[PDB]
Structures are given as structure tokens and as C-alpha cells.
Structure 1
């Protein structure tokens, strides 16, 4: 059969139940870090049918109404006080940085897009962002906030082709299918044209045949059940830690950002076409207990000199890299939709190409 090399990634919209939970988790975190930059937050959410359970462990001087915050995320998606029961079992308290958990994180970067992210990811996110922009401006009417995208790209040749764009969008009972299909097709062609790609791909629109019920209603959502949508869409490895609802002292989050920041800067500095960085942690240890730099035989100089330049260019102290990425004063709600990485539409510290100068100098040029 032989074929072809076909890589695929997905995204989900703000109304997807798994992502409602990530949004509520990070909104509660943002509320705490506003008032108290020393807040400890480990906030998890279950959205099951018409019951939302907010849980976890918070230490903060901040006044926070976890239920009120949850409604502030839900209401804009079109729900009202009649749609959910929302309850808290959150345990709230007052009063060098060692890791607070064991575990592994992965940073990843490549040169396929201006975002230094895989093309599959970028196209999947961009589809849903444009559909959501059009929903808010009423350019695309009679749709709702729960949606999913999936983009398959054919890497058989020098130049990537789009093989398939798939979309599922929650629609009103009384929608016009002809209108809806035309709107989605034109949006798919618009996104393709924006990354200068082929226009002639297979289009799969609402293949289930009907999508009126969405969000948590027939269904379940939980915090940290979109950890691949949140990262590198199956192109990069993952250590298993979820991001949303965690303050910067959880190395699951801050080290994953730190590693992205390295990877992106390694590729930007033309040391490699792709770079993946594994950090492992041990409870009480102020630096990663282990490190692996994978460059997938795309290194443009010696693998050994890349490793040297990374060790010389970055501080691996957890407290220090937390401060260097201003993670205590970063807004997290914006990265709870459409991924944590390559957000040319945001202003994330870990996406800044402010270490290329240092890597070039520290690579014996």
C-alpha cells in the first residue's frame, strides 16, 4: 500500500467540556495571583451533565469565590443560572524553591511555522479561533461554543500538503445546513490560504450528522484531559502533567514552559530544525535531576556544542527560571484555550526569542 507520511493533530473550542474545566481552573488561579503573588493553587474541576464540582488545595491571602468565578466563565458561552448546579470542595487556607513533585516534562519546537510549532497544531487551533471570532461578531450565526477541529497533513514531499481538515461545530436546532457547510468550507480555505497551502483537500464537516447538545450536558469534562491539545498535538512527547489550575511552584507547569522557551530559542538560533528537551524532577531538588536534548538528526552544528550552549545560556534553578519567565504575573486563562505554545496572538514570556544571541555566542559561534 506504501502511501505517504500523514501526521494529524486536533484542537477544541471554549465550549468543549474538558476545556470549560481548564478555563475555570486557570480563572481561579488568575483571581488568586492578582491579589497574592505567593498563592499556592492546585484547583481541579469536574463538569458532569448539569453538576460542576470545583476541588483542590488553595493557600492564598486573596478573597476568591470559586463558584462565582466558575459562573463568570460559563455565562459568556451562553448558559444561565438555570443550566448548572456548581459546588466547591476546595480546601482554602491562609499562612530557594525545591520541586514539590517527582515527574518528567517535555519542551518542543520546529521550523514549520512562524509559531515554531507543528503545522497540524497551528491549522487546528486557527480553524477554531476564526470560527469563534465569527460567532462573536455574528458573521457565522446559529452556532455555539462547543467545537472540535482535526487537521491531517501529508509530509510525503519537501512541501507539506493538507490531506484533510475536519470540523465539528455545535449548531442551533433551526440552522441552515447549506449555509453552515458553505461557512465552514470558506473558513477552511481561508486558514489554508493564510499559511500558503493547497486548497484542494478533503473537507469533513459535522460528520455525526447532528450536534445540538454540547458542553457538559450529555457528557463529562475534567481539568487536564486535553494535555496534547494544550502542548504539541502528538508531534512532541509528553510527561503526563496537566497545566491548568496550578501555580508556578508545580514544575509540571513552569518547567514545561522553561523547556519550550529553550527549544524555541535553539531552533530560532538555527542550531536545529527541531529540538525536544526532557527535564525530570525529584522532591526537594532545586534543579532538574536529569536532562535530555533530542535534535532528531536536524542539528546544524555538533549535538555536544548545542548541549554546552544551553547549559551556559539558561539558569536551571526552578525559583530563578520561574522569575525569568515572570510566571507570578502571567495571565493563565488566555492559554486555557488553543494551546500553551506558539501563541503569536498572545505575549507569553516562554515564547520570546530573547536567548538566540546567548545560544549563538555560547556555541563557540
Structure 2
């Protein structure tokens, strides 16, 4: 059919790529709790019966990577004998470190080159694309019910996908799709009814229609799951972690990385700018691209896109942003308290628009400055 049907996904806490992101970030959190000058780039692979914990860490901390891994996998139903754990923790290259640690100048140089995008829109109270919001809410509710035993005979590996029709000014849900790992002895009629009710409850929470197509466990059988069914790796859900394919992406993964890795810290910074632009009613949608060079303390380029939804001249938005924000890396890392933020909570259900958390980059504390500086 000829329609503007846009679709986003989410994955659950027992999805194998997400297991890896959680182990990465739990390891990071333990390092930063002990040593706020740590350099951490922790990458995890989970396949069949092997978890590999790798990457580059220089720190005065000590993290028990096995115990950390068990903290992620035990609430999903795994035990201490399910995986071989390989710890292959190298140090940070001293050639990278000397570029980042500009001790001479009181600066932080970017930890790599790269491009990041921040995005926000006015479709939801979270300032996020509705497709992404709904996809995450479905899986958060299913996992909440799995743990409380309100939804029985399911497991933690799951995925969702939500399609919205934006052909006219009011969004309508077109399709909600979920796949949930289930026990062998499940009752498919009970399962279908539980999923259908969750789907309707999420639609009603956002005041949307309830007569959309429902695709429920389309494979027809999902008993094998987690890393047994599919290999996970850190940073393989970067679109689920961000804006569901509505926002552009520069390719950088977040989990496992300390704030000197601009892939993470500048992504958060760009979100904070974009969200405040939209909350200030300067635009309905805003995307901020920032580019970096390794060792340089400021971005090498910036572009601001308001998708023709700017309410004032784009040059005044651009100017207001430059006057309201500090683009020095060390400074924005400190402005967002990134050394003392806990990252494990954002390793599932997305890093942005988390009205269930209290993230620095989600604060609307720049609206007044943007309004004043746009005049």
C-alpha cells in the first residue's frame, strides 16, 4: 500500500547482543566507581557456551569480570556452569593515551575520529520517535511480567518491532510485532492473549488506536534462545540503542566505553542539544551531527538539521546553540557528569528518552538559554 510506514525495533535483556552490552557497561561501571580516570573500551562476545571479555583497559581499579558477568546472566536464568569465560583485557595503547591526555593544556583530546548524531522530536513526552518508544515499552512490560510471574512459561530472549503510519498528521499504529522465547510446554492460546493485551495496554497508554495488525511469534517456535541460538557481541544494537532508524547514525557503539570515547560522550551531548532545541519550541525535530579528530579537544564539524520544522530562522537556532553550549570535550563531559553516571541502566531499552531514569543528557536545563540566545 502507498503509505509512510516507519518501523523501529527493540530487544530484551536476554537477547545475546544485549547481554554483551550489559556485561560491557557493568564492567565499565565497576571501573569508574573505583577510578574516575580509568580508560575503558570493553567488548564482549557471547556464543553458545563461551563469553569472551576483551578490549583495552588502563585503570587502578580491579573488576571481577566473572562475578560481573554472573550478575547479568543469573537474572536471565543462567547459572555458574553455563559458560566458559575468557578474560583478555589488554591495556590502552600509549599512543592513543598521549593524544587524549593533553596534560600540558588542561584539555581532553577526542579518543578517536568519528561522526555522531543527536536527535529529538516532539512525538512523545520522551522527545523520541514513537516507533522506538512503543517497541521498548512492549519489551519492558513483558520482562517486568516475566520477573513478577504475571506472564509465565517465557524466557528472557525477546524482540519487538513497531510500525507506525505517519501518512497523515496523527500517527496510527500499523503493526506491533513481538517474538518471545517460550518454554516447551507453553500454552500458545494463553501466550497470544497475554501478548495481545500487553500490546493494547501500551497503545492505550499513548492514546493510540488498538486495531493494528499483531504479529506474535511468527517463527512458530522459539524454545532455543540466548547465546545458544545466536551469537551476541557488544555494539551490534546501535540503532535500538539510539533512535530506531528515524535518526541517522555515525556507526559508533556506546557500551563499555569511558567518556573520553566521543562516540559515547558526544552522542549524549548531541542528544542533550537536540532535545533542548525541540523542548524550547525552536523546531519539531532536530538532528545534530558532530565530527571529531583524534587528539583534538573540539569537534572539527557540526551540522544542525531541523527537517523544515524550524519555527524561527535556522541561522538563529545555530547561533543560539553556539551561545548556549560549550563544545570543549572535557567541559561537556563534566557538564553531563559522565564520570559519575551509571551506564548499566542504559545498556537495555535505549540510551535516550528514558522517563524511567534520570540521565544528565535528558535534562531540559538549556531551554531558557536557547530561548534567550535565539532573539
- With the length of structure 1 as denominator, give the TM-score of the two structures: 0.98
Q: Is the 8 A contact 1:279 1:292 kept in 2?
A: yes
Which whole-Å deviations, capped at 9, do the CAs of 1:98-125 have from their partners, x for residues lacking one?
Answer: 1121110000000000000000000000
SS of residue in 2 equivalent to 1:126: helix
Instruction: Kindly state the Cα deviation for residue 94 of structure 1 after the two structures are TM-superposed.
Output: 18
SS of residue in 1 equivalent to 2:85: strand
Instruction: Kindly state the Cα deviation for residue 156 of structure 1 after the two structures are TM-superposed.
Output: 1.0
Q: Is the 8 A contact 2:18 2:234 kept in 1?
A: yes
Instruction: Kindly state the Cα deviation for residue 218 of structure 1 after the two structures are TM-superposed.
Output: 2.5
Distance in structure 2 (CA, Å) of the matches to 1:327 and 1:105: 17
Q: Is the 8 A contact 2:53 2:65 kept in 1?
A: yes
SS of residue in 1 equivalent to 2:358: coil
Distance in structure 2 (CA, Å) of the matches to 1:100 and 1:153: 38
Instruction: Kindly state the Cα deviation for residue 76 of structure 1 after the two structures are TM-superposed.
Output: 1.2
1:160 correspondence with 2:171: yes
- Greater displacement, 237-246 / 68-77: 68-77
Distance in structure 1 (CA, Å) of the matches to 2:112 and 2:136: 31
Instruction: Kindly state the Cα deviation for residue 67 of structure 1 after the two structures are TM-superposed.
Output: 2.0
Instruction: Kindly state the Cα deviation for residue 219 of structure 1 after the two structures are TM-superposed.
Output: 1.9
Map residues 29-108 of structure 1 onto 2, 5 A cutoff: 29-91=28-90, 96-108=107-119
Instruction: Structure 1: state its 5+ residue gaps.
Output: none
Instruction: Kindly state the Cα deviation for residue 157 of structure 1 after the two structures are TM-superposed.
Output: 1.1
Which whole-Å deviations, capped at 9, do the CAs of 1:264-297 have from their partners, x for residues lacking one?
Answer: 0000000000000000001121110100000000
Change (3 A) 1:138 1:94: farther
- Greater displacement, 282-291 / 114-123: 282-291
Change (3 A) 1:94 1:240: closer
1:267 correspondence with 2:278: yes
Instruction: Kindly state the Cα deviation for residue 137 of structure 1 after the two structures are TM-superposed.
Output: 0.7
Q: Is the 8 A contact 1:267 1:274 kept in 2?
A: yes
Distance in structure 2 (CA, Å) of the matches to 1:52 and 1:63: 19
Q: Is the 8 A contact 1:127 1:149 kept in 2?
A: yes
Across the two proteins, how many residue pairs are aligned to each other?
Answer: 363
- With the length of structure 2 as denominator, give the TM-score of the two structures: 0.95
Q: Is the 8 A contact 2:99 2:295 kept in 1?
A: no
Q: Is the 8 A contact 1:61 1:94 kept in 2?
A: no
Match of 1:322 in 2: 333
SS of residue in 2 equivalent to 1:328: coil
Q: Is the 8 A contact 1:59 1:94 kept in 2?
A: no
Q: Is the 8 A contact 1:44 1:55 kept in 2?
A: yes
Instruction: Structure 2: state its 5+ residue gaps.
Output: 92-97, 101-106
